[PDB]
Amino acid sequence: AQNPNCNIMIFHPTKEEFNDFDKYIAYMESQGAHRAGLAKIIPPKEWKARETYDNISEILIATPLQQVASGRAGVFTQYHKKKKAMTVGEYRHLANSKKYQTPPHQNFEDLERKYWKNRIYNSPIYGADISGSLFDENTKQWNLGHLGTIQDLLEKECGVVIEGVNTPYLYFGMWKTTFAWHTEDMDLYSINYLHLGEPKTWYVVPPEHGQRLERLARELFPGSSRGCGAFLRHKVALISPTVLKENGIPFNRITQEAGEFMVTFPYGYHAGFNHGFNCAEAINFATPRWIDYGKMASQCSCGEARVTFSMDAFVRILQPERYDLWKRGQD
Numbered sequence: 001a002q003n004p005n006c007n008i009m010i011f012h013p014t015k016e017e018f019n020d021f022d023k024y025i026a027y028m029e030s031q032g033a034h035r036a037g038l039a040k041i042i043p044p045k046e047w048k049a050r051e052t053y054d055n056i057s058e059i060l061i062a063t064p065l066q067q068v069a070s071g072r073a074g075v076f077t078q079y080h081k082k083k084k085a086m087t088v089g090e091y092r093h094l095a096n097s098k099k100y101q102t103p104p105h106q107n108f109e110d111l112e113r114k115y116w117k118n119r120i121y122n123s124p125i126y127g128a129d130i131s132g133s134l135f136d137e138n139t140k141q142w143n144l145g146h147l148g149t150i151q152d153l154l155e156k157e158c159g160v161v162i163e164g165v166n167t168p169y170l171y172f173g174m175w176k177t178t179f180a181w182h183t184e185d186m187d188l189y190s191i192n193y194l195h196l197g198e199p200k201t202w203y204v205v206p207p208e209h210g211q212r213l214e215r216l217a218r219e220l221f222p223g224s225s226r227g228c229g230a231f232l233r234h235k236v237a238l239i240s241p242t243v244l245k246e247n248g249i250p251f252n253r254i255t256q257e258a259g260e261f262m263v264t265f266p267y268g269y270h271a272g273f274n275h276g277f278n279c280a281e282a283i284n285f286a287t288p289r290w291i292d293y294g295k296m297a298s299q300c301s302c303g304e305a306r307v308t309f310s311m312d313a314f315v316r317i318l319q320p321e322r323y324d325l326w327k328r329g330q331d
């Protein structure tokens, strides 16, 4: 069995290997990359996402989100307070202000220490989940707006044509902006490209151990667990690496830098934080290997998770017994 310790793997495809996206995902899996839940892909030196980032300041962040924490430094939830719209140039200036900028630090490990010590005492503002793309239309390789759609994959594997669309999302971050512990909708893959700016640190639990994380989370967030049998679908709970280690939960960590891709694999729980002003693009995708994960994915039916239009068909076809309850939670 390849990668039996479930380490995060880093790949350096050549320009020739970068042509065929599906084939390269399958290659990475042949080497055991999925066992980690997360892989890094460093593009060939010949590749670029677009020519420059000099002309992005007028993009609008219609609903910036202030991430307010409650709890203790290593075990907390966050809620999202909506703020007034602002442009990317306005947001960048805000991120660089004395109130929000990255503190002085020695290296990524020192900054990680500072994040976990101090995150809860601040409320950073995240420009998350903005439909759009920064890939040039002429970029033919690993262009996150030109991937095969999940609806087409389901149709190819299962024969059933379904409604829905699959487009990318932009994320504008600042110091301490945080993504809570989660797997993707319907335990899909994700791919994330860090277009510009400061790094993003990731934590991940191997898919084969995801239920260990869920059991810890039920213990640590006991009111939330009573409220909902899949409350990590709410995307609000954080648990630090120190707490994970104290409770024997298997996990790994890695820092993504500008110009790098990360892939999350089906049922790979992940969480993390941004080092400073940055912009990422991400989208969900599927492969044949996903189908069995989609059929077994947990679902939130309490009302909190509320998701896209396109998840309806995935539940309806892959999980018909759960469909009626889940759709009630949507309405």
Ligand SMILES: O=C(O)CNC(=O)C(=O)O
Pocket: 171, 178, 179, 190, 191, 192, 264, 270, 280, 282, 283
């Ligand atoms: O970058 C973020 O805030 C969160 N991204 C992801 O969870 C992802 O790409 O799957």
Ligand SMILES: [Mg+2]
Pocket: 055, 056, 057, 058, 059
């Ligand atoms: Mg612009």
Ligand code: NI
Pocket: 182, 183, 184, 190, 264, 270
């Ligand atoms: Ni994710």
Ligand SMILES: [Zn+2]
Pocket: 227, 228, 229, 230, 231, 233, 234, 300, 301, 302, 303, 304, 305
């Ligand atoms: Zn719920």
